[PDB]
């Protein structure tokens, strides 16, 4: 691999390990291979957001052109967010597309993803369904995102009012995970969620 790519990643990996943000358990990174082309990241959900108390793992692939192109980052841990696909974990963020600069690092990417969680841009969505709900019904989006933080990301609390609707459909014989996804995507309409599950 190119010496500049290898040296940059080795430097940036240690900077994350030694960081104040890692000592506070906000971010971390681990190696996957021996060659430094695949990494696994973890970020904590930010405070005063639906993602609080959740932990989100990230697939990080380093291009042969690093540091002049951005890493490819994907959410492994499912998340309900306008700028992250609830199906694939693909991320819409300018620094991972057209506003990467070579001075950016693993640290600043991980921190930027946390800032994205704290401040969505629903007018440039990755997930049109999540974005529609974010704008049309803020309180539902927040409770749905918190439910997903609990179900997928280990966040402690989730909301009793959704529990009831989840249990009804679960009692129809549908899988709890499928029920969660159907009800979230149909904005908690039992009837259209049931229709989806029946297909």
């Amino acid at each position: 691999a190119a010496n500049i790519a290898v040296q940059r990643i080795k430097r940036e990996f240690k900077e994350v390990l030694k960081s104040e943000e890692t000592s506070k358990n906000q971010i971390k990174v681990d190696l996957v291979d021996e060659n430094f082309t695949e990494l696994r990241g973890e970020i904590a959900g930010p405070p005063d957001t639906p993602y609080e108390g959740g932990r989100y793992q990230l697939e990080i692939k380093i291009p042969e052109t690093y540091p002049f192109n951005p890493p490819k980052v994907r959410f492994i841990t499912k998340i309900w967010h306008p700028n992250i696909s609830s199906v694939t974990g693909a991320i819409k963020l300018d620094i991972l597309r057209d506003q990467w600069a070579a001075a950016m690092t693993l640290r600043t990417v991980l921190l930027s993803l946390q800032a994205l969680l704290a401040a969505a841009e629903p007018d440039d969505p990755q997930d049109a369904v999540v974005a529609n709900q974010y704008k049309q019904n803020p309180e539902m989006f927040k409770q749905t995102a918190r439910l997903w933080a609990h179900v997928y990301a280990g966040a402690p609390v989730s909301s009793p009012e959704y529990t009831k609707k989840i249990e009804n459909l679960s009692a129809m014989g549908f899988d709890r995970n499928a029920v969660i996804v159907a009800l979230s995507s149909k904005s908690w309409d039992v009837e259209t969620a049931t229709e989806l599950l029946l297909s």
């Binding site: 819409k92 300018d94 597309r97 057209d98 007018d123 440039d124």
Partner: protein, 76 residues
């Protein structure tokens, strides 16, 4: 040929063009006068967004026609 381009401010940009000019050329002129990047510019005439490769003459755009400019900040 003189044409006008209206913004949502109300501000009218006056441009000098030819019927043979493409829509991207018109956007390049708008950049020269107003410092607005062409990839942020959507030009509208007769209720329809105009496309970059076609000319003013293709759209029946004439002397003292008024286009509309809406700024759409990229959004990939």
């Amino acid at each position: 040929m003189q044409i006008f381009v209206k913004t949502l401010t109300g501000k009218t940009i006056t441009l000098e063009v030819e019927p043979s000019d493409t829509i991207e050329n018109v956007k390049a002129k708008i950049q020269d006068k107003e410092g607005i990047p062409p990839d942020q510019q959507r030009l509208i005439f007769a209720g329809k967004q105009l496309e970059d490769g076609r000319t003013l003459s293709d759209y029946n755009i004439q002397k003292e026609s008024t286009l509309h400019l809406v700024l759409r900040l990229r959004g990939g």
